[PDB]
Amino acid sequence: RPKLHYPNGRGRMESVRWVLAAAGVEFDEEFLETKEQLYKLQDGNHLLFQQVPMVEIDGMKLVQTRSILHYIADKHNLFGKNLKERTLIDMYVEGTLDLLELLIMHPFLKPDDQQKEVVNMAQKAIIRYFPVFEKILRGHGQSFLVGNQLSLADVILLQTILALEEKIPNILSAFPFLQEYTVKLSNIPTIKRFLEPGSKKKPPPDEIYVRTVYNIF
Amino acid sequence: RPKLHYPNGRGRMESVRWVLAAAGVEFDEEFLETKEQLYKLQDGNHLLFQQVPMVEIDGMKLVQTRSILHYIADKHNLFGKNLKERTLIDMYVEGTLDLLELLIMHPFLKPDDQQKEVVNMAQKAIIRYFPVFEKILRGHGQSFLVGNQLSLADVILLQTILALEEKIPNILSAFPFLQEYTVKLSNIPTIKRFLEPGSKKKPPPDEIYVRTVYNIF
């Protein structure tokens, strides 16, 4: 049973929860709340590079989010069936992660900048990303980005889109394919559950989380 | 023959040149110098997500540096021989990239901050990274980080270490294993060449590059 190390919040660990969940893998969590708990962690030589996310899985202590996600994907058929597949998934993933980031950084912005920034997400999404995906989808008619099966790209995309919708509720408006895709995915049972209550799915970060994060580091 | 799109400078494309070179793969370059050349590129629908690096390879237009490096690695046995291997390489790579970044951002700093920042690289390297590697090496006695063969992790590490040494010439001092490793690697012919003159190996970014970069974007 995979163990997740991280503060209790979304952060960067979210995508991990997301994948795990989708894979229908149950896992546990050990929360950081202090610099000190962190210290012990590092002190124990648990964090390969002194930082979290760290995930204990398959007798390993994985670090590096991308690294981790790739592991799990590979452990559960979320990584395609060949190089070409793999390759796409990969790029889709990296690109998305780039957008997701804005979300990730958001909370630590100077409230004033927070706003400007929302507007910016909106534009990148609309302009840079959503279109790519819409097209892909539009052009193969399948319910998955790649190879007619759920992949890592789908989960990150989903993750992100929702997250974005939390800030810009209508962002999808011009992307009827993306809308459909989103719906269906969310219907996948694992996901459906994850989305439901009492999931390890974290909420949008609050003042506290931030504080704490600032505290731990 | 792979074609590299990017301004004429190191930037993030460097690691690509590095890997290509090490793989002993010849490739070409198309330089960006203007917003406009960029526009056409995007206009043509060449940049999957509107940005560079972009690399034309194997009839593809790869984008996302990590994405690309993984491709090439996979095309040339720089990615290990199994999941466990792969997995390490991956993490080593991600971690290194994190350090390399400092280098990457460096030039665009307010000269005043540039200095503070050097000091910081020094510390992270010394404290966070170098030690991990030294240990690894120290503990298996091999000339490669992973599986007794050159991998992607080795190239990025090399890349970075040198780059760092360009700013903090003695950074390696306390890491006799890392020193040895570095030497030997640099002796690998491909590399040796890459390091020699008339290689596609770019130099440390100058005022111009910066300017240009600022210009293109």
Side-chain angles (χ1 to χ4, degrees):
Chain A
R1 199 163 177 180
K3 191 179 277 214
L4 275 54
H5 292 277
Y6 207 65
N8 180 350
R10 255 166 206 195
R12 310 201 161 268
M13 188 71 82
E14 210 66 2
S15 346
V16 188
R17 304 171 175 115
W18 262 94
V19 184
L20 279 178
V25 172
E26 261 167 303
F27 58 78
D28 321 275
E29 302 189 291
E30 226 213 64
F31 291 133
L32 303 164
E33 334 142 52
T34 321
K35 186 154 263 196
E36 178 236 35
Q37 335 184 236
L38 180 43
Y39 279 145
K40 342 169 77 183
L41 202 34
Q42 14 205 187
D43 179 57
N45 276 2
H46 299 304
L47 309 186
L48 173 68
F49 302 115
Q50 290 342 278
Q51 343 175 225
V52 291
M54 192 272 291
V55 166
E56 311 200 46
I57 201 227
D58 296 339
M60 300 151 107
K61 306 191 185 129
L62 320 172
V63 294
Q64 304 289 331
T65 328
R66 306 194 194 354
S67 285
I68 291 156
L69 301 167
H70 300 157
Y71 177 71
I72 301 175
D74 264 333
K75 282 317 262 182
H76 299 70
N77 203 223
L78 291 181
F79 225 138
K81 317 232 162 145
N82 74 67
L83 195 57
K84 295 328 156 155
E85 287 193 13
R86 206 170 159 102
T87 299
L88 298 174
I89 305 227
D90 190 6
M91 285 166 147
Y92 296 168
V93 183
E94 291 322 310
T96 310
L97 274 196
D98 284 356
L99 172 71
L100 183 56
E101 195 64 15
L102 300 193
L103 280 169
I104 297 219
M105 321 181 307
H106 192 261
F108 302 86
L109 283 214
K110 303 57 43 228
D112 144 26
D113 295 356
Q114 297 201 315
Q115 208 75 11
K116 194 296 125 206
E117 282 302 331
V118 176
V119 165
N120 190 73
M121 323 190 155
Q123 312 188 250
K124 302 260 131 300
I126 287 309
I127 289 174
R128 199 154 283 194
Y129 298 97
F130 287 182
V132 177
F133 300 130
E134 190 99 343
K135 176 154 154 175
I136 279 164
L137 287 183
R138 184 161 163 328
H140 64 45
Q142 352 163 291
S143 344
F144 296 104
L145 279 186
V146 169
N148 220 21
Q149 117 200 346
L150 193 64
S151 81
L152 185 66
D154 302 305
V155 190
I156 303 300
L157 186 50
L158 181 58
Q159 159 171 209
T160 301
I161 281 169
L162 307 178
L164 273 161
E165 297 199 322
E166 302 171 350
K167 309 202 154 185
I168 312 143
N170 41 316
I171 195 104
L172 274 199
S173 56
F175 313 90
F177 280 88
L178 281 173
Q179 324 181 346
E180 215 180 341
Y181 176 80
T182 292
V183 175
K184 320 200 239 67
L185 289 188
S186 342
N187 304 264
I188 311 194
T190 37
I191 298 186
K192 177 188 197 209
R193 307 182 224 90
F194 184 72
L195 295 166
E196 282 165 351
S199 58
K200 298 197 222 63
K201 171 165 190 325
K202 305 288 181 285
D206 47 67
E207 191 277 289
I208 291 63
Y209 175 72
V210 173
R211 203 37 190 324
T212 293
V213 157
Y214 280 122
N215 299 163
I216 307 207
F217 316 93
Chain B
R1 199 163 177 180
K3 191 179 277 214
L4 275 54
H5 292 277
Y6 206 65
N8 180 350
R10 255 166 206 195
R12 310 201 161 268
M13 188 71 82
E14 210 66 2
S15 346
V16 188
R17 304 171 175 115
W18 262 94
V19 184
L20 279 178
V25 172
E26 261 167 303
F27 58 78
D28 321 275
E29 302 189 291
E30 226 214 64
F31 291 133
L32 303 164
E33 334 142 52
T34 321
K35 186 154 263 196
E36 178 236 35
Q37 335 184 236
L38 180 43
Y39 279 145
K40 342 169 77 183
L41 202 34
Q42 14 205 187
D43 179 57
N45 276 2
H46 299 304
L47 309 186
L48 173 68
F49 302 115
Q50 290 342 278
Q51 343 175 225
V52 291
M54 192 272 291
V55 166
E56 311 200 46
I57 201 227
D58 296 338
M60 300 151 107
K61 306 191 185 129
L62 320 172
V63 294
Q64 304 289 331
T65 328
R66 306 194 194 354
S67 285
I68 291 156
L69 301 167
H70 300 157
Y71 177 71
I72 301 175
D74 264 333
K75 282 317 262 182
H76 299 70
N77 203 223
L78 291 181
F79 225 138
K81 317 232 162 145
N82 74 67
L83 195 57
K84 295 328 156 155
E85 287 193 13
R86 206 170 159 102
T87 299
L88 298 174
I89 305 227
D90 190 5
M91 285 166 147
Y92 296 168
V93 183
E94 291 322 310
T96 310
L97 274 196
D98 284 357
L99 172 71
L100 184 56
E101 196 64 15
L102 300 193
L103 280 169
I104 297 219
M105 321 181 307
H106 192 261
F108 302 86
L109 283 214
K110 303 57 43 228
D112 144 26
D113 296 356
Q114 297 201 315
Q115 208 75 11
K116 194 296 125 206
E117 282 302 331
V118 176
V119 164
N120 190 73
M121 323 190 155
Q123 312 188 250
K124 302 260 131 300
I126 287 309
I127 289 174
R128 199 154 283 194
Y129 298 97
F130 287 182
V132 177
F133 300 130
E134 190 99 343
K135 176 154 154 175
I136 279 164
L137 287 183
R138 184 161 163 328
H140 64 45
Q142 352 163 291
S143 344
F144 296 105
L145 279 186
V146 169
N148 220 21
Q149 117 200 346
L150 193 64
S151 81
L152 185 66
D154 302 305
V155 190
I156 303 300
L157 186 50
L158 181 57
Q159 159 171 209
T160 301
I161 281 169
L162 307 178
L164 273 161
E165 297 199 322
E166 302 171 350
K167 309 202 154 185
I168 312 143
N170 41 316
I171 195 104
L172 274 199
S173 56
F175 313 90
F177 280 88
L178 281 173
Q179 324 181 346
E180 215 180 341
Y181 176 80
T182 292
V183 175
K184 320 200 239 67
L185 289 188
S186 341
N187 304 264
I188 311 194
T190 37
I191 298 186
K192 177 188 197 209
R193 307 182 224 90
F194 183 72
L195 295 167
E196 282 165 351
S199 58
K200 298 197 222 63
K201 171 165 190 325
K202 304 288 181 285
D206 47 67
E207 191 277 289
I208 291 63
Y209 175 72
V210 173
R211 203 37 190 324
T212 293
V213 157
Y214 280 122
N215 299 163
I216 307 207
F217 316 93

